[model samples]
Each structure stands twice: as structure tokens, then as C-alpha cells.
Target: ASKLRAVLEKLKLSRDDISTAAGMVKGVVDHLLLRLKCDSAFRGVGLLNTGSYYEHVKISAPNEFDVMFKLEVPRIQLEEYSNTRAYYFVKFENPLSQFLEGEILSASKMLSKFRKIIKEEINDIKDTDVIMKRKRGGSPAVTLLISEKISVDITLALESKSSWPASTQEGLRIQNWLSAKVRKQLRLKPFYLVPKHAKEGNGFQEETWRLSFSHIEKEILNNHGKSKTCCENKEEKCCRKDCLKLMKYLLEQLKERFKDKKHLDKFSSYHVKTAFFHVCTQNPQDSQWDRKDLGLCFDNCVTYFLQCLRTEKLENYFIPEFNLFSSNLIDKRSKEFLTKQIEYERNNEFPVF
Candidate 1:
């Protein structure tokens, strides 16, 4: 972890930035483990409450052992993609303290707070008269609001030899406490476990407990199962024409709202990775290799975006208005050549690596 931090710092990332990224990666890893119910020292985990459609939980032990929990409404209950919500929690024991300390946890908490704020803002705007505005073409000049709310609950504690039994017990106790908290505070049904009934000699476990979420599962599945499209899916062939028309109308509305921004340069595009690399390369404090590495990262993002466009058959939509080749024309030429090769592969139906 220190080595990774060193690399990130050398590339001009602050300690906080590196820690934030680390926490996200760790959170995802732990969540996956809990979903599989993998046996580990890190146990006593369950979804507390889903703010969005799916809920994710993560736990890590003193020795860096980790577990994660993830729950989502099954597809059958989904009504629309926007109606889905998810939650995640990450817990860790003592020896793993170094990873979750300071800005790492702070960043995660901030994200959780941001989700709440946005959800509240959406609710506030839902009943406004301005929200019902229509364009001259007799089409509603708005799009459906999609909101997601999330909260993270993390507990960090020390484990001792004498406290081992009680500490382990406390973990389970906390899990039950969280379950009740979700039920009472969030007004959501608590998931219950029911033992499986099967023959004892069938070479299978008869008393396995199954996790059930009842109506919440039904609600999420109903939302997700509904057909809807947004700007992201504008290029997909399967998207409804009405959805496409709505998207275009929304874009026009946004453009009109921002049209009078004289200070905002429309010609400029900000590539954070590129900007960081540029500053690092120009700074006397940074090494040439550090700058070169960031440059590589920037190039990778560009290449990745280009590849995505080609895969979606939207390559023609990309307009290279920004000058990404101001410094070295040779490097720019190389990138262009690689892009063409990718396009050729797409045209030939060759597998993209």
C-alpha cells in the first residue's frame, strides 16, 4: 500500500487523493466477499439498509482480512432504472487501521453526505411549476430526475487476546443492532433468514439460511425491469425513439440555460490526468519519469474513450476540437495511428483486446 501511495504521490496526487482511491478499491473488494458469504475472520455482516436499489457492506479484520455484503432488489421488481438505490458500509478491525484512517474515511463520508444532499434537492424540485415547462415543439422540456442516496457505516476497533471472544460477539451484536436501526429509522423491512428444509442424506446442507428482503426486493425489481433510456444510452440501437427525442430536448434546455456564460471557454476541455502531468513535468520538484507516467495515464484515458466510441459505432460523433498534440506532434501521430488501427479492427469485426 505504501508503495502504491508513493507512485501516486510521485505522479502529483495528494495523500488525500490517493487514500480516497484506495478506500474505493478496498470497499468494492470487501463488498464482493460478503456477497459470496465467504468464510473469513471478518464476519458478522449484513445489509443494513439500501438507500438506492442495491446495498453493499464491507468488513475488514485486524490482519487485513475482509468481507463484504451486497444486496439488490431482484430484476423482476424493477420498474425503472432511476428508481433503484443502493447502500454500502465498510468496517475494519485494528491492524487495518492504517488503511482506513484520516482522509480515506473522510472522503467516503463526504460522498455519503453528498448523496443525501442531492436526494433532498431532487425531492424539493419535484413539484415546481418550472419543472413542467414545455418547448415550442409541444414537448416537455425536461427529463425524469434520477437520484440515489447512500450512507456508509464504519466501525473501527482494537482486538486483544483477552477480548477475542467478546470482541467477536460484539461484531454479531453490532450486526443485529444495525438491522434494527435500518428497520426502525429507514422504515424498511428487515431481511430475515429462514432455514432451508431438505433431506439430511441428500449430500446437501439442510439448515442453510436464506436471505430475504420481501417487498423491497419486489420494489427494486419492478423499477429496474421497466424499459427506459437516457443520454448514456442515446447511441444504443435498442433505445426507444421517444427516449432519444426527450434526451435531445433536455440537452437543448441545458444549452439555453448556459448560453450566456461569457467567462466559460467553450473551446477548452479539461483532462485532469493531462493537466496533472503537465504541471508535474513543468515543476522543478518532480522527476521526468513521474511526468511521463502521468502522460501515459492521460493517453490511456483518451485511448479508452476512443475505443468505447468505436465499439458503440459513435466514432464519427467525436470531434477532436481540443489540441491534445501541442507539445509533440510525433506522439500525437502515434495516437492517431493507434486509433485508426482500433477503427479498422472494429470494421473487420475483430476482437478488441
Candidate 2:
């Protein structure tokens, strides 16, 4: 109660705002909770030990909380008893919409409807390659893996900065006119996607619908493979080696390019960091089939790079190179949080197979 009060204070919401937000949240939660209880697809552990949850909410910048939650979970589970764990962080660029409808409620309702529509559209399509799998006689059960609950963090700027101030406020008011309406209409949750206008600005304002369970499952399948395969898979090995070669070659070229007198010393950091950025951003033109192995390779490269940086002997020797690799990096907070969480989890005790 105290925490919720503190959140309300921080949000600077009025009584009406609180009521609206609460109603919205209630509707979304009710729907998701019921789904989680009844839907087998929404249950079970995920590949890489990931899993869904009944409900998890966080307020503030999604990135910040995501990092913190990822870091804390491992440790928390080690020291505590938890059957399942998941993390959700959300930030709404539009606060007016949030005030009218609770963050969770609006986002969830939007997402739910979006999923239904998309599924229908997908089924209507005749393409067999993009078709969704269905259950058959005595076949593996088809899981309806939808996200049970969505967490939302509202940003007040969306309400305050609209160009049409009067109209925006009016729209919000109408949207939040009643508790039941707010609940039923505003339960859709939104999610992040590579924005169409990503090249334009800071790439934040794009509104999106929440990802469906099928979408989540597809993503996992796309990135991690149909099922978990061990090191015996040569495809994984090839992918890791290719990424290593690319990183190593890029680093070497950078070292040579900067090899000069003292005048070039000042510019070395800039050059190295830019080179790394380009390497990180570079994408392959191949189709999904050809690119599947690259995911494991990149994962290995990141892990190996981090390991190399932590080694005591390599630390001093690779100072200049390391400086470039570490400079101008984003997601620092999330990375630190993840590190701490991993450390905590390592120190805690859990059931061993």
C-alpha cells in the first residue's frame, strides 16, 4: 500500500487518475490471471530456462528496471523459493492515455485484440511457409503461449507535450470516462519493435501492441532453434567461429589503422569504438535459414569478449583495445544489473539436478 501510494505520488496523479488507472489495471490483470490459470500454452518453462508469469509490473524507464530485475532474479531465486520467474518493464510515452486508462489495462486490451486480429489475418493468408502449427490426432499438444500479464511504466511527457493540448486532454477524458469502459477497452499491452522511423530521431515515440504468445514462441524458435541442441550441432560451432573471425579481423584492422606517432594517439579511442560499433551493427543479407546459426555465434562472441576483458593478465595488456571496446556503449545499467544478478544467483542455493 505504501509503495503504491509512493508510486501515485511520484506520478502526481489525481483521485480520478488513480481510479482510472486502477480500473484499467484490474481488468487487464483479471484477464491475464484467468488466462494463465487456464491456458497450458501460458504455462511451462521456456528454452534457456525462461518462463512466463501471472503478473509482473514495474514503473519508470523499462530499460532501467529490466536490467535491475534481470540481475536480481538469479540471486533472489537462489536465496528464496520461487516456482516461476519472469520480468516485465514498460514506459508509456503517453501519460494522458495512461491517466484515462490504467497502464496495464490499456496495453493488455490493445494487445489482446491485436493478437486476435493478427491470428485471424494470419489464418486467412494462404502461405504455407508462414503458417502456424496446429494440433493433430495424438500429436504433440499445441500450446497457446500468450503473455499472461503485462507490466507498464507510464511517462507523463506524452500528456504534457501534445501539440493539440485541448483535444488530447479531451480524448483522454473520454477514454477514461468510466471504470468499466476503461477496463474493457484499455487492457491491451504494448511492446517494443524495431521502429519504422528508427533512422529518424531517438527512436522512442513509436506506439506498438503487446507481443502475443505465438509471437514470443516464434521469436524463441527463430533465435534459439526448434529445440535445444547441444555442442554436437556443427552449425552452432561454425557460427561462433565466423563471428570470432569477424571480430578479430576488425580489431586487427583497427590496430593497424591507428599505428602511428603520438599525434594519432588522441584519435585512437574514437576510431576503435566506431569500428566496433559498425561491426556490432552490421547485418547479413541472407534469409532466415542462413542466419539462424549467427545468433549462437554472436552470443558466444559477447561471452568470450567479456571473459577476455576480466582476465587479470589480459586486462593490463589490452587496455587500449579494451578502452575502445567499452567506450560509448549503451545498455550499461542493464549490463551491470545483469552481472550483479548473475553473481547473486551464483552465491545462492537452489535445487540441483
Candidate 3:
């Protein structure tokens, strides 16, 4: 019991580390980014500190972050990209439209312009040295390698006050889980998409952006409990965060052993997170995940995830229509091996942790 407690405790971040990292990212958003957006010739709406670091589930040292620099216009229109409904083209007609005018702006062109401006801004920073990473095709983020290990992704996000994308309209079934009131609140939150990706075709307008519900995702995870402050009491911490960290660590640890394998490459922190979202929706109440039942809760989550891998039917929490396994990221032999590895952890009390 003491061994389990110690391991779980160590898996979490100390307060000092989280505070320092938050301070730095906040500065990145406020000082340089906010000012740039405020005065830019092509500025959008505003900025949001969205991504894993802001979410409590981020593991170990805060090495990665994601921020959204939003562009909001009341008269905007969108065109969905090929095959994927989540990605879209920000379309509008009217030179009267502020920020977006004359002709429709290509997402690719906007992202490129934003990148150039950010590079100029980095040079003007008098404090610490920040360098822009080389542009990677189809990636929406303009990253700054702040330190040797830490990376920040500054994304040009298109914000819509409208309804969610068509595919996600039926998803996020938090009404029954988190209640109608909470669901309404979340729905009112703005939707965003970063400029990147499109299907291949001659008329393939690939510059349209992909939808991002990261802010809502974070809200759901942080307030996962039915009761507010469910995990705040000194003696009543829930297993939600701990279980998530364990699963995330387990994947990274396994990835180390399977370097020659490709199936596991598609597996990511987001997959684990989506699975947990479904788990919470399925088991909404507190008793199902009692604070004292860490081992049981973790085992159940692992078992559930193993089931999805076996059937290859893990659906995106936001885009229920899109099966993450629609393509062959994991082969039969690979899934079988993964199931074995997780079983080994469950049966052996997760010695990997």
C-alpha cells in the first residue's frame, strides 16, 4: 500500500514546477502574443491558453504547450474540408468585413503570415532567447523552442460563436452525465479550428482549418465530478487524474520498447483522454470511482481501453462519427501484444509505474 502511494505521489507535479511553467506560458501569451494580436495588420479576435499544460493531466516536466490566437468575425462563413467535417475553410464576402476582406483568405496564407510576424516578434523580445522552428508542412502550430526541452505551439485559431461542426452536434453527451445546465454552459463556449490539412484532390482546398474543442475538453476533465470540489478535500482525492497519468505513462513506457513497430505510433495522449471521457460519461456518479478505489478504477479503465483496441472502435469523444480506428493504425498482432502488456500491468499491479 505504501509502495502504491509513493509511486502515485511521485507521478504528479510539485506545485513549484507547475507555477513556474504557468507563469512563463502566461507571459508568452500576455506580453508578446497579446500585444502582437492587438496591433497586427491581420489580427483576429483574441488569444486563449488552451492545451495539455493547462489541463491537469499533463505528465512530468511541462515540456509542451498549446495556445490559440483566435480570429472572430460576426459575418464569417465556413466550408468543410474533404472527408473530414471538422476541418473547414473560413469564407466570407464583403470588403466591409473587418480583418477579413476583399477576397476570401486562404488558411494557408494566413498561417504563413502569422508565422512571419511571430518570428519578427521573437527577435524584439529583450528577455530570453526564443527561436522559431522550421515550418513543417500541414502542421498548424508555429512552435518556439523556448529552452532545450520545452516547446510551445502558437496556433492561429478561427473562432466561431456558432454551433459546433456538423459531425460533433451529436457528440459530447454530457447532458445525462454532467446535467443539462452544465451542458448548456459548455455549448455556449466558442468553437475554434487551426489552419492545417485538407484531403488530396485537384480542387482540394486544403488550407481550411481543423476543429478544436480543447477548451471544452479541459473543462470537462477538470470538473469531472458530479459535485464541485469532489477531489479537493484532503482525505477525498479521486482516482481520475491519477488513473489518467498512469495510462499516459504506460503508453510512453511501452513506446520505448516498440521502436521498430509502427502501429503504436498512432496511439497518443489524446486517445487515452478520449477513452477516459467515455468512461466518465458511462460512470457519472462518484461511487463508481470512489477515492479509495484507485487500483480498481485504473484496472477498469485499462480493461475498457483494451476492449477498444481489440475491436478497433475507439470513437472520438467530440466527433463520434469519426472512428479513430477507421484507418489501420494498429494491426491485429500489435493489438494482441498491447493487450498482453496491459494485462501484465493489471495482473502485476502495474510494475511499470
Tell me the lDDT of model 3 at 291: 65
Top TM-score hit: 3
Question: In model 2, how large is the Cα lDDT of residue 353?
Answer: 5
Q: Give each model a TM-score.
A: 0.18, 0.20, 0.84
Candidate 2 regions exceeding 4 Å error are 1-107, 127-129, 133-304, 308-353
Candidate 2 yields a Cα-based lDDT of: 0.27
lDDT of candidates 1 onward, in order: 0.27, 0.27, 0.69
Model 3, 1-353: lDDT tens digits are 34555666776545355456666666665655555665544455466545433333346445676666777756568777666756566777332243343455566666656777778887886556667787544466787776554577776777778877678877888876788899878888888777643222123454556677888987887788887777878755677877777778778777767768665655678788888888888888777778678778877789889888778888888888767654443456767777788788778877776
Residue 348 Cα positional deviation in candidate 2, in Å, after optimal superposition: 34
Cα shift from native, residue 302, model 3 (Å): 0.6
TM-score of 1: 0.18
Candidate 2, residue 163: lDDT: 27
- Ranked by TM-score, the better of candidates 1 and 3 is 3
User: What are the candidates' C-alpha RMSDs?
Assistant: 24.7, 24.5, 3.8
Candidate 3 or 2, higher lDDT: 3
TM-score for predicted model 2 compared with the true structure:
0.20
**What number of backbone clashes does candidate 2 have, counting pairs of residues 3 or more apart or in separate chains?**
16
Per-residue lDDT of model 1, residues 1-353, tens digit only:
23323433443332233343345434443443343233232233343334332222111111121121332212111111121111112222432233343422222232233233333443444322111112242110122211111222222111111211111121211112123343233233333322212211122421122222333333322222122222224332221222112222222333344457532112111222222222222321212223224433333333443543233221111112223332221134433443564455435432221
